[PDB]
């Protein structure tokens, strides 16, 4: 029913399902051991993540999973994005096999390493936070070089591997170039004014979202425009209101966020420009 692609196809009998990593609401991700998914050593088994449909999945969710799979093939390999490893498409339910990130999403990762319970031995230094940002800028610079927009860049959609590599995830809303559906399904506190009002999206709209992600990061998983409801945000952005500086954040980095939150997308930095500026700061730290 779903067309064949031998390049990516993985045999079902070698995949072994495991514990659910999380239910996003339109999708389901489970841990799994996969034998010989790494072609260079066919005998060894490796822990992967498998996205599949819910039981209460809709008609739209099946095409969105396939769309996302197709997006992941043409994006190509990068260190700072979740990468496609394989798929089970034939004669069974659709399993999309992607890299495993053992330390979860960046929001929980950061909240867990703030200096209830759940707090580990390893807490976040300034150099560590800057290195998170720079890693994510590289990921996003790559996506932009592939003429691809993400449109859902949030801390919750960034995953962290065992070796604390930041990986950008969820290419659900991702598109190749954009004229919006007039009713796009994009989170409002991360959305650039153009995406919100003018139904357009460029790479410069992702830069704005990156602006908010930086704030998220330097508040160690804070939630943007705290206390301000979505209804009351539209008018504030039009008046030029922006978020204050996080406490564990230099004047320089804050100015980088504020550069990201220009209302005129061309006056914002490009991802290339952010990678330049963040490497510079990472070196000096």
Active site residues: 152
Give the contacts of 84 (CB within 8 A, at least 6 positions apart): 8, 69, 72, 73, 96, 97, 98
How buried is 64 (Cβ within 10 angstroms: 0-12 exposed, 13-18 middle, 19+ buried)? middle
Q: x/- contact string, 66-85, with ligand 9WX (CB under 6 A)?
A: --x-------------x---
| CA 161 to centroid of chain Cα atoms | 13
- Known binding site: residues? 21-29, 51, 99-101, 105
How buried is 192 (Cβ within 10 angstroms: 0-12 exposed, 13-18 middle, 19+ buried)? buried
End-to-end CA distance of the chain: 54
- Known binding site for ATP: residues? 21-29, 51, 99-101, 105
115 sits near a copy of itself (criterion: CB under 8 A):
no
Q: Report how far residue 104's alpha carbon sits from residue 155's, in angstroms, rounded to the nearest whole number.
A: 11
Q: With CB under 8 A as the contact rule, which of the stretches 38-46, 56-64, 125-133, 136-144 interacts with a copy of itself?
A: 56-64
Q: Scan residues 209-228 and list those touching a copy of itself (CB under 8 A).
A: 223-224
Q: Report how far residue 168's alpha carbon sits from residue 154's, in angstroms, rounded to the nearest whole number.
A: 9
Q: x/- contact string, 138-157, with ligand 9WX (CB under 6 A)?
A: ------------------xx
Minimal distance in Å, beta carbon 176 to a copy of itself? 19
From ligand 9WX, a copy of itself, none, interface partner of 112 (C-beta below 5 to 8 A by class): none
104 sits near a copy of itself (criterion: CB under 8 A):
no
**Which residue lies nearer to a copy of itself by CB, 89 or 271?**
89
């Amino acid at each position: 029913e779903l067309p064949e692609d031998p390049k990516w196809e993985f045999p079902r009998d070698k995949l072994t399902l495991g514990k659910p990593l999380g239910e996003g609401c339109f999708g389901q991700v489970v841990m799994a051991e996969a034998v010989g998914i790494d072609k260079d050593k066919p005998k060894e088994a490796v822990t992967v993540a498998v996205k599949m449909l819910k039981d209460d999945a809709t008609e739209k969710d099946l095409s969105d999973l396939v769309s996302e799979m197709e997006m992941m093939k043409m994006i190509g390999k990068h260190k700072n994005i979740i990468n496609l490893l394989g798929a089970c498409t034939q004669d069974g339910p659709l399993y999309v096999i992607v890299e495993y990130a053992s330390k979860g999403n960046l929001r929980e990762y950061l909240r867990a390493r703030r200096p209830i319970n759940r707090v580990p031995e390893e807490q976040m230094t300034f150099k560590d936070l800057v290195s998170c940002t720079y890693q994510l800028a590289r990921g996003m610079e790559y996506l932009a070089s592939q003429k691809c927009i993400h449109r859902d860049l949030t801390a919750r959609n960034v995953l962290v591997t065992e070796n604390n590599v930041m990986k950008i995830a969820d290419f659900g809303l991702a598109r190749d170039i954009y004229k919006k559906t007039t009713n796009g399904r994009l989170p409002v506190k991360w959305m650039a004014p153009e995406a919100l009002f003018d139904r357009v999206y460029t790479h410069q709209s992702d830069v704005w979202s990156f602006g908010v992600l930086m704030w998220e990061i330097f508040t160690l998983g804070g939630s943007p425009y705290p206390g301000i409801p979505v209804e009351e945000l539209f008018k504030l952005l039009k008046e030029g209101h922006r978020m204050d500086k996080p406490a564990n954040c230099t004047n320089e980095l804050y100015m980088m966020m504020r550069d990201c939150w220009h209302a005129v997308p061309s006056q914002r930095p490009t991802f290339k420009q952010l990678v330049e500026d963040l490497d510079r700061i990472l070196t000096l730290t």
